């Protein structure tokens, strides 16, 4: 009876661990996605910016 | 006084042997016990050993 529960927090600190790992994988490549975007923006408007 | 304290000197010669040995007797148990328990420990260990360049436990991906 007390096995059970001692498992059962066990595996959810496991449960935990990996959705913690996951969401942060997703984040990581969003922003760096986004950050390339931002980047090709930038080169863009600096091969249309203008002046001297 | 004299007496007894020549006495109390050879008795507490006698003690502090005792005591020190009893000590390290008692150090020696716990450390015959400790190599019991892992003497039964390594039963448990797979054949072939630990793969120490991997993690016990994957929790996670890696992309």
Same mark, same amino acid.
């Given at each position: 009876n007390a096995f059970s529960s001692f498992d059962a927090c066990r595996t959810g600190l496991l449960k935990q661990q990996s959705a913690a790992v996951e969401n942060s994988l997703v984040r990581q490549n969003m922003a760096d996605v986004r950050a390339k975007a931002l980047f090709e923006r930038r080169a863009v408007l600096l091969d249309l910016v203008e002046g001297k | 006084q004299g007496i007894k304290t020549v006495y109390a000197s050879c008795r507490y010669r006698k003690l502090n042997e005792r005591e020190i040995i009893s000590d390290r007797y008692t150090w020696l148990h716990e450390r015959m016990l400790e190599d019991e328990v892992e003497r039964v420990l390594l039963?448990?260990? +797979?054949? %072939? %050993?630990?793969?120490?360049?991997? +993690? %016990? /436990? /994957?929790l996670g991906p890696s992309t």
């Open positions: - | 039963e448990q260990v +797979p054949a %072939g %050993g630990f793969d120490k360049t991997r +993690p %016990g /436990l /994957l």
